UniProtKB/Swiss-Prot annotation:
This is DDB1- and CUL4-associated factor 1. Residues 13-212 are annotated as: WD repeat-like region. The protein kinase-like region mediates the threonine-protein kinase activity. The DWD boxes are required for interaction with DDB1. Component of the DCX (DDB1-CUL4-X-box) E3 ubiquitin-protein ligase complex, named CUL4A-RBX1-DDB1-DCAF1/VPRBP complex. Interacts with DDB1; the interaction is direct. Also forms a ternary complex with DDA1 and DDB1. Interacts with NF2 (via FERM domain). Component of the EDVP complex, a E3 ligase complex containing DYRK2, EDD/UBR5, DDB1 and DCAF1. Interacts with DYRK2; the interaction is direct. Interacts with RAG1; the interaction is direct. Interacts with LLGL1 and LLGL2. Interacts with histone H3. The lineage of its organism: Eukaryota, Metazoa, Chordata, Craniata, Vertebrata. Ubiquitously expressed. Induction: Up-regulated in a number of cancer cell lines (at protein level). It comes from Homo sapiens.
Amino acid sequence: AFRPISVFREANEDESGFTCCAFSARERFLMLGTCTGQLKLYNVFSGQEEASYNCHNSAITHLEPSRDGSLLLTSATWSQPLSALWGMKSVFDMKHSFTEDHYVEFSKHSQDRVIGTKGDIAHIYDIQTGNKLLTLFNPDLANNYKRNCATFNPTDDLVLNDGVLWDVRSAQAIHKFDKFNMNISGVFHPNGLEVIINTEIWDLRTFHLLHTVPALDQCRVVFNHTGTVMYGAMLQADKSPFGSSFRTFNATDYKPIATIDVKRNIFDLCTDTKDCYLAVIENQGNMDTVCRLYEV
Ligand SMILES: NC(=O)C[C@H](NC(=O)c1c[nH]c(/C=C/C(=O)N2CCOCC2)c1-c1ccc(Cl)cc1F)c1ccc(F)c(Cl)c1
Ligand code: NA
Ligand code: NA
C-alpha cells in the first residue's frame, strides 16, 4: 500500500513550483528542483525548507545526486547550459556543465563519468576534467526515438543509446534492438541480464525477446534501491511530463503489483535509500505542485 504520510509545498511561494525530486545521501532530506531553476533541500517529515541554491534560469527537469553525497546532476528546460554537475562539499558550486545535453546520468558502478543525451546522440564525460570522452551515434543503427535517454549498465561496460547497445571500451555498437514504438529507448534492469525497451524485455546475452509487458507502454521507469520493485508512469504525448497514474511491478518476474491513480498530473517520483518512503510531485491545479510522501 501507499499511505500518505505527509505533504508539503514550496515554502512561502504564491505558486509552488516543485518539478523534480531525489533523496539526498543525507537521510530525512529531500532535494527538489523548481520551475524557476532552484534546488531546495527539505526536511521530509517537517515539510520545512532548510536550504536553497540557484542552479538554472529555467525549470529543472531532472536531478540525480551521487551516492557519495559529493556531487549532483541537474538538467533544465531552456537554459544554456541545459545540464550541469555540482559539487556539494564545503561550498555548492558548479564543477562542469554539459551545453546542449537535456538529460544526464552518472555511471552506476563507479560514479566517475556522466552520460548525457542530445536527441539521438550520447555523450560520455569525465567527472574529473569535464572532458567529453566519447560521442556515441551510428547512422546505420539509429532508432531515432523521440524521448531517447542514454544510460550505462550496472557494471558501466555497456551503454544503451537510442535502443543501440554499445561496448564502451571499444566505442562500438554491438547490437541494435528492433524498434516497436516511437518514443521510449529503454533501460537496463539492475540484474545486469535484461534490457527493458518500452514493452519489450530483451535478454542481454542472446538478444532474444523474453517478455512483452503492455502496461509499460510509454513509461519512464525507476527501480527501488534493492532492485525488487519497478515503478512506471506513462508520459503524456507531446506541462506535466506524466499523467495521473503510476504502476508498480515485481522486478523479478514483471508481474503487476499495483496501479496508483493520484487524480492529478505527476511531475516526478523517487524512493529513499532504504525503500521506506515514496516521494511524488503532483500538480494541485495553474502550476501549483506539492510533494507528497507515501509510506511504502
Ligand atoms: N528521477 C527519475 O529518474 C524518476 C523518473 N523521472 C523522470 O523520468 C522525469 C521526471 N521529470 C521529467 C521531465 C520533466 C520535464 O521535461 N518538464 C518538467 C518541468 O517543466 C518542463 C518540462 C522526467 C523525464 C521525462 C521524459 C524523459 Cl525521456 C526523461 C525524463 F527524465 C520517473 C520514473 C518513473 C516514474 F513513475 C516517474 Cl513518475 C518518474
Ligand atoms: Na536541524
Ligand atoms: Na527475472
